[PDB]
Every structure is written in C-alpha cells, then in structure tokens.
C-alpha cells in the first residue's frame, strides 16, 4: 500500500505523575493565586501550578481583527512524566502574589508557570490574519495520575501568645468580557497534567 | 471494502476514579466555591474542583453575532484515569474565594480548574461567524467512579475557649440572563470525571 | 529505498532531572520573581529557575509588521540532562529583584535566566518580514523529572528579640496587551526542563 | 557511495559540570548582577556567571537595516568540560556592579562574562546586509550538569555591635524595546553550560 | 586516493587547566576591572583575565564601509597548557583601574589581556573593504578546565582601630551603540580558556 503514514499529524500529550502536599505555616499572609483573562481577544491557555511534579502540553491557533487575510495550517506532540513530595512555607511573612493571568491579551497565550519542583512543559502558539476554512483538528490526548491533598498545617508550644498565624487568599476568578477561547485550567497541589487546543475567528468593520 | 474508517470522527471521553474527603479544620473562613455565568453570549463549560483525584473533556463550538458569515467543522478525543485520598485546612484563617466563573463572557469558555492533587484534563474550543448548517454531533461519550464524602471535621482539648469556628459558604449559583448553551457542572470532594459539548448560532439586527 | 531521511528536521528536546528546595532565613528582603511581557508585538519565551539542576529548549520564528515580505524556514533540536540539591539565604538583607521580563518587546525573546546551579540550556530564534504560508510544524517533544519542594525555613535561641524576619514576593503576571505568542513559563525551586515553539504574523495599514 | 560526508555541517555544543557555592560575608554591598538588552535593534546572546565551572557556546547571524542586499552562509562547533568548587567574599565593603550588558547595541552581541574560575567558551558571530533566503538551520545541540546552591552566608562572635551586614541586589532584567532575536540567559552560582542560535532580517524606509 | 588533505584548514584551539584564587586584603581601593566595546563599529573579542594559569585563541575578520571591494580568505590554529595558584593584594591603597577596552573602536581588536601569571595566548585579526561572499567558516574548537574561587579575604589583631578597608568595584559593562560582532568574554580568578571568531560587513551612502 501507498506510504499514507504522513498523515499522522495529531496526538496532544500522555502522561503519569504521584505525590503529596501544597502547604503553609506562621504569621503573615498577604497571598493568593493568580486569577485569569479578563477583556482579552483571542486564545488563551492558563495554567499554573503550586506544587510540584508538573507536566502540560498547549496548542492554540488565532484569526485576530478582520481585513485582507491567509492560510493557517498547525500541528503539536509530546509525552513526559514526574513523581514527587511537597510545596511548604514555615514563617516568612508574605506579600505573595502567585501570578495573575493575561487580562487586555490578543492573539495566543500560554501563561503556564509554577512555584514547586520536577518541572516538564511544551508549549505551541500560532496567529494569522485569516478567513475561510476555519475549525479542523484531529485525535488529541491520553492521560494518567495518583496522589493526596492540598492543605494548611500549625502546630507550637504553650508561649503567652501562640498559634499566631494571619492570611489572605484569592483563588482562580475566570474569563470577564473575554471574546474567543478561553481555557483556564489551574491547580494548587502536586501532580499535574494538562491538556488544550483552541481555533478562531473574529472582527468588526 | 472501502477505506471509509477515516469516517470515525468523534468519541468525547472515557475514565476511572476512586477515593475519600474534602474538610476544613479551625477559626476564620470567609470562604465559598465557584458561582457562574450571568449575562455570558455563548458556550461556557465550568467544570471545578476542590478536592483531588481529578480528570475531565470539555468541547464547544459557536456562532456569534450577525452579519456575513463563514464555514465551521470542529472534532475531540480523550481518554483519562486517576486515584486519591483527600483536601484538608488546619487553623489558617481564610479570606479564602475559591474561583467565581466566566460572567459577561462571549464566545468558548472551559473554566476548567481545581484546588487539589492527580489532575488531568483536556479542554477543546472554536468560534466562528459563521450561518446556514449549525448543530451537527455524533457518538459521544463513556465513563466510571467509586468514592466518599464531602465534610467538614472539628475537635480540640477542654480549654478556657474550645472548639473556636467560624465560617461562611458559597457553593454554585448558575446562568442569570445568560444566552448561547451554559453547562454548569462543579464539584467539592474527590473523583471527578466531566464531559461536554456546546453548538450555537444568535444575534441582533 | 530512496534516500528521505533528510525529511527527518524536528524535534524539540528530551530530559531527565532529580533534587530538592529553594530557601531563605533572616531580616530583610524587598524581594520576588519575575513577571511577563506587557504590551509586547511578537513571540515570547520566558524562562526562568531560581533554584538548580537547570535544562531548556526554545524556538521561535516572526513575522513583524505589514508590507513587502519574503520566505521562511526554522529548524531546531537537543537532548541534556541535570541532578542538585538546594537555592538558599542566609542573612542578607535584601533588595533582591529577580529578574522582570521583556515587556514592549518586538520580534523574538527567548528570556531564559536563572539563580542557581548545574545549568544547560538551548536558545533558538528568527524574525522575517514574510506573508503567504504562515504556521507549519512537526513532530516536537519528549521528556521526564522527579523531585522535593519550594520552601521558607527558620530557627533561633531565645534572645531578646527573636525570629527577627522581614518579607516581600511577587511571583509572575503576565500577557497584559500583549499581541502574538505568549509562552510564560517559569520555576521556583529545582528540577526544571521546559520546551516551546511560536509562529505567526500581525501588522496595521 | 559518494562522498557526501562535508554535508555534516552543524552541531553546537556538548559539556559536563559538577559543583557547589556562590557566596557573600560582611558589611556593604551596593552590589547586583547583569540586566539586559534595552532599545536594541539584532541578535544577542547574553550569556554571565559568578560562579565557577563555566563553558558555553554561541551563534549568531544577522541582516541589518533596508537597502541592497547580499548572500548568507554561517556554521559553528564545539565539545568543552569543567569540575569546581565556590565563589565568595569576606568582608570587602561593595561598590560592585557586575557587568550590565549590550542597550541599544545593532547587529550581533555575544556578551559571555564571568566572575569565577575554570573558565572556557566558543563564540561565533555574523552580520550582513541580505534579503531573500533568511532563515534555514540543522541538527544542533547536546548536554549534561550536576550540582548544589546559590548562597548567602554570615556568622560571628557576641561583640557589642555583631553580625554587622548591608547590602542591595538587582538580577537580570530583559529585552525593553528589543528588536530582533533575544536570548538572555545568566546564572549565578557554578556549573554552567550554555548553547544558542540567532538569525533575523529588519529595517524601514 | 587524491592528496585531498590541504582541505583540512580550521580547528581553534584546545587546552586544559587548574587553579585556586584571586583577592584582596587592606584600606584603600578606587579598583574595577574592564567595560567593553561602546560605539564601535568591527568586530571585537574583548578577553582579560586578573588571576593566573591563562591561555586564548581569538580570530577575526571584516568589511569596514561601503565603496569598491575585494577578496577575503582567512585561516587560525593552536593548543595549548597551564596551572597555577593565586593573585593577591596586601595593603597597598590601590587607584588601580584594571584596563577598560575598545571604545570607538573600528575593525578588528583582540584585547587580550592580564594581571597574573603562567600566561600563554594566540591573537589573530583581519580588515578588508570586501563585498559578495561574506561570512563562511568551518569545524572551530574543543576545551577542558578545573578550579575553586574568586575572593576577598581580611583578618587582624583587635586594635584601637581594626580591620580597615575602604573598596569600590566594576566589573564588565557590554556593547552600547556597538555595530558589528562583539565577543566580550572576560574573567576574574585563575584557570582562564577563551575561544573566538567574528565576519562581518557594514556602510552606508
């Protein structure tokens, strides 16, 4: 038979990962994480990770604005894997901000960042100027993972002011005024595996 | 026979799960999960997680506004699995929001998200302005889970002032004044598997 | 057979790594991490690793503005692999900014850039004028890594005035107005391997 | 058949490390590492260490600026290895700036700059004034490292004013207003290995 | 077989070495090493080295403005061997400014240069006013090296006014306005192997 093999083109990621704890301990918090796309015009991946054992693939392709325009063709692969313990702070005061994510963007964005360890990515962003055939895509992912939990832990001895601990914490608000495709996937804890494609059009005249 | 296979288009998911909590411990919560979509024109999928052991698919295709429009043909394809133990807080005091999604929103959104260990996922999404053939689909989905409890877990020793809480609690309010196609499926505690899929056409003159 | 093994052009990187944490102790720091790529027209990488046992790959490939325009063609591929043990303070004060990235940027960014220990990396970029075909791509990536934790830590004798600790952390924003390929993706601790590829075009008449 | 063997043209680098400390002791520093690449218009490598143990290589090709233009043709290769210890100070009080490197510079830089000790590189850099066929490259890169910490460190005896330290630390801003091909990548600490390639065409009229 | 050998024309250099410190002891420095390359228009290896046990090979050829225009065809080889201890000040006040390079410079500079010992080296330079084929070179180098620290250090009796020092430092700015190729590679401490080539052409009318 003819040497069709070629038109193997898509397979997004696969992966396996295991582990434990995101964590932490005395006096103050000031801190939170990150929070996602607000008004932004296009395609945007977010992920983020505090905590360790991390693994992520993203695909994204763009028609921004409208006008004149041309031909798109994109393609992405991988596989990676990871095993791990903890996230852990002990009594550092904290102004911490954990990474807020791609507000007023255009075209394509991977925000795909971390605060942990064993630390894997591939990462793949495409714009044109383009109208016509719009859409296609082909096969996508596979996936594996075991693990236990995010948690706060405190523990002292009887001192004549103990326990004394004072936080403060946003976690992931999504997509306002946003126009496009939105993925925001984001965790707190080990063992991550993420996944994403995204394809558009849009304008005014 | 003809090499017609290439006709096998779509499958959404499939999956397996198991394991046990989601708790929280001492003092101050300001505290609540989620909440979703009002006033959004288009396909949202909010899929959340607190707690672990956590996979999902989410696909959406769209046409948004009026006016000259364009061709759409969109495809997806995973499969998944993941096993756990829990989600824990000891005595941090939390200002504490977890992750309010996707209002005034247009076009694809997957909030797709989690608070949580062993995650994986696969999120999928297509705008165009595009009239004329709108809402074709075919086969679909698979899954399973096996699991527990969501809980909250308080004791301590008979001291001068024992057993001090105090907490406040949000879960999940959905699509006030929204338009287009709103999938809302969130959830606290462990062993999560989703899947969707969204087809749209609406505008004004 | 014919020789048409010189077809075989792409792959990204592959990776294995292994380690422990990122610390520090006493006093003053006015201190964080990074933070991405605001108001930038172009393809971006930022990579950075406060922490050890350090490998990457990037590519990147442009077209910038609108008018007459040419051809393109990129290539790029490595392996390489790395093992440590811990980033760490003691008692310095610190006005310890580590590192902002590449905002108003145009054309290409690999920002690839560490604190730490055991590094290798690969750095690979291209900016053309060119319209016509845009977007092609194949093959790309492999990986693996297995590890601890980000952490604070502190202990001291019973003096007079003890525990004496002062802190400040930002860790990450990105994307705001930016337009092209945004890839953001950094670490806080050891471990660290990271792969990406961008491609695109965008003007004004 | 045929002596086809000079077509093996490309590959950058390969390298081994192994290593330990970058450190600080007493009183003043107005002291900080490097920053990056503002305002300018080419291809630059920044590579920097304080830190011992060090190799790297670098290529870079270039057109600058529009007009009448001619051909392009650039190759580089390397093996190198190094084995180390430490870099610290005792008590030097510290107007000590280490190297800021190459604003508002055109064509190619590679700024490959230690403090430390076993020290060994490769650089290669081109510039033209060409257009037409811009972009093409082959096979490049191999590598490995393994390691301990970044470090700050300070004890001494109870005298009447002890433990007297000061000090001020800038790391690594990138690429404001850059035009071209940007690769910053820096370390501090020992082990370091470094590979990169740059290729690019730009101007007005 | 034909006496094809003759084709055998480039190899850079190779080398091996091993070493301990450079340092500094008692009151007064005005002292810094080198700053690199503002204004110039060629191409420039910047290489210094204050500490022992050194060894380079730089190449480097150029078109310099834009009129009628000749034939270019450039050659460089060695290897070469060290090993060494210290460099080292006590007590001398010190205005000791150790040799900033190459500003305004034009063609081609190899500044090479030392404060230290066991010193070997090979330097090799070339201008023309050339157009047409440019930038071609082949095969280039290989390294070895193996080592410990930069330093200060400061030790004295308990006097009515003990340990005096007074000291301000530079080390290594890069490449502003520069036009070109700049090679700035520069080290303090001892165990120094520095390998480099530059091609160029650049006017206007």
């Given at each position: 038979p003819a040497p069709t093999g070629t038109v193997a083109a898509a397979v997004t990621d696969t992966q396996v990962s295991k582990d434990n704890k995101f964590d932490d301990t005395k006096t103050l918090n000031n801190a939170g994480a990150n929070g996602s796309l607000s008004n932004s015009k296009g395609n945007l991946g977010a992920n983020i990770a505090a905590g360790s054992g991390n693994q992520q693939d993203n695909a994204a392709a763009i028609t921004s604005s409208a006008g004149d325009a041309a031909t798109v063709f994109a393609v992405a692969d991988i596989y990676q894997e990871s095993k791990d313990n903890k996230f852990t702070n002990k009594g550092t005061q904290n102004n911490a901000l954990l990474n807020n994510s791609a507000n007023n963007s255009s075209g394509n964005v991977g925000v795909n960042v971390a605060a942990g360890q064993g630390n894997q990515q591939k990462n793949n962003l495409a714009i044109v100027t383009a109208d016509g055939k719009n859409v296609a895509a082909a096969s996508n992912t596979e996936q594996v993972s075991l693990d236990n939990h995010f948690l706060n832990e405190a523990s002292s001895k009887?001192?004549?002011?103990?326990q004394y601990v004072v936080n403060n914490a946003g976690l992931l608000n999504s997509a306002n005024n946003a126009s496009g495709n939105i993925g925001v996937n984001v965790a707190a804890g080990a063992g991550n595996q993420q996944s994403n494609t995204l394809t558009l059009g849009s304008g005014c005249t």
């Amino acid at each position: 038979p003819a040497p069709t093999g070629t038109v193997a083109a898509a397979v997004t990621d696969t992966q396996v990962s295991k582990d434990n704890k995101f964590d932490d301990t005395k006096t103050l918090n000031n801190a939170g994480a990150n929070g996602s796309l607000s008004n932004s015009k296009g395609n945007l991946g977010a992920n983020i990770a505090a905590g360790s054992g991390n693994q992520q693939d993203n695909a994204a392709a763009i028609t921004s604005s409208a006008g004149d325009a041309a031909t798109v063709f994109a393609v992405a692969d991988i596989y990676q894997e990871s095993k791990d313990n903890k996230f852990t702070n002990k009594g550092t005061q904290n102004n911490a901000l954990l990474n807020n994510s791609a507000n007023n963007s255009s075209g394509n964005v991977g925000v795909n960042v971390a605060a942990g360890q064993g630390n894997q990515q591939k990462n793949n962003l495409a714009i044109v100027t383009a109208d016509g055939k719009n859409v296609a895509a082909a096969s996508n992912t596979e996936q594996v993972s075991l693990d236990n939990h995010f948690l706060n832990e405190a523990s002292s001895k009887h001192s004549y002011k103990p326990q004394y601990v004072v936080n403060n914490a946003g976690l992931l608000n999504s997509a306002n005024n946003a126009s496009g495709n939105i993925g925001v996937n984001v965790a707190a804890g080990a063992g991550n595996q993420q996944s994403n494609t995204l394809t558009l059009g849009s304008g005014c005249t």
